[PDB]
């Protein structure tokens, strides 16, 4: 036994779905991919790497991608880069930019009252 979850893009874009059988083995349930979260059926697993869209678990996320289908992949953690590490040289900025970012915070709720 186990839970059954439906993975889907918004219905404003597509009506395609994929079904995850949580903690279930793909040979127990009866594009079939076995993950630690259970058996994922309907999504095509690829060896590419993207930013996480609809998270499944254990490093696996699903997304609706280009013709169009639902795919599964291991999520990217960030851009791969490398930092210079010399003992006799220093990097110094010759220019700069000014950036503006936004931050949004809740302050209050709707006030209610109940006549018991």
């Amino acid at each position: 036994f186990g839970g059954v979850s439906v993975i889907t893009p918004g219905t404003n874009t597509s009506n395609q779905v994929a079904v995850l059988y949580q903690g279930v083995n793909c040979t127990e349930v009866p594009n079939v991919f076995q993950t630690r979260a259970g058996c994922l059926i309907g999504a095509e697993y690829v060896n590419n790497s993207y930013e996480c869209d609809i998270p499944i678990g254990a490093g696996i996320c699903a997304s609706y991608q280009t013709s169009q289908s639902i795919i599964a992949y291991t999520m990217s953690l960030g851009a791969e880069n490398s930092v210079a590490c010399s003992n006799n040289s220093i990097a110094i900025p010759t220019n700069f930019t000014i950036s503006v970012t936004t931050e949004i915070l809740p302050v209050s709720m709707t006030k209610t009252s109940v006549d018991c």
Binding site: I90, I92, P93, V100, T102, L105, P106, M109, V114
Partner: protein, 211 residues
């Protein structure tokens, strides 16, 4: 303005507050249709159909079920109230430290070096605009911890020693702007024999060309 317009999800935190309270009230109303073991969800039907000694018992079931629904609602509101109080406390802190001053706390008032912030009003909350300074276009220079001159170790007062390739200069760390190494931009402490990586370079004395 374009960022907020093109990405509606930006204000999801404010919408979530509205949605959670709206759901809580709708759920509470729907519970009235429950029977909780009673023959009917309607109080009048129980009293009209059954005699006192039985009618009261099934009414007791409806009263208990409805009291527990109200208690559930209140408990959830108390927990959510705590979540909002914490958010409001943070918003008030940011107002004081980001808007009414300049912050030296990393990533507290946006990404990069904080210059200033501006508040904006919003439904059930506050929006901050954070203005920050970001370094760009860095270049590699050769460096040294000190300059050796007249047997003495010279250290920079407010900067770093660099070599554009052959000449030595002293500059500020956050923006390349090379200056001649003199005796009013360095200080002297110790000899040249205890500084690892020290290099030889003449330090200019602005008084001697005049005398």
């Amino acid at each position: 303005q374009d960022s907020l317009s093109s990405t509606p999800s930006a204000l999801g935190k404010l919408q979530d507050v509205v949605n959670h309270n709206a759901q809580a009230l709708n759920t509470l109303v729907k519970q009235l249709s429950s029977k909780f073991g009673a023959i009917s969800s309607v109080l009048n039907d129980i009293f009209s159909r059954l005699d006192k000694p039985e009618a009261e018992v099934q009414i007791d079931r409806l009263i208990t079920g409805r009291l527990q629904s109200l208690q559930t609602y209140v408990t959830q509101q108390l927990i959510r109230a705590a979540e909002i109080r914490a958010s409001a406390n943070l918003a008030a802190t940011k107002m004081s430290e980001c808007v009414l001053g300049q912050s030296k706390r990393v990533d507290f008032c946006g990404k990069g070096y904080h210059l200033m912030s501006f508040p904006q009003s919003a439904p059930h909350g506050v929006v901050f605009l954070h203005v920050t300074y970001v370094p760009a276009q860095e270049k590699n220079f050769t460096t040294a911890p000190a300059i050796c001159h007249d047997g003495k170790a010279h250290f920079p007062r407010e900067g770093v020693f660099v070599s554009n390739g052959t000449h030595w200069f002293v500059t500020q760390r956050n923006f390349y702007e090379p200056q001649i190494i003199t005796t009013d931009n360095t200080f002297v402490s110790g000899n040249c024999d205890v500084v690892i990586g020290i290099v030889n370079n003449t330090v200019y004395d602005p008084l001697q060309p005049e005398l």
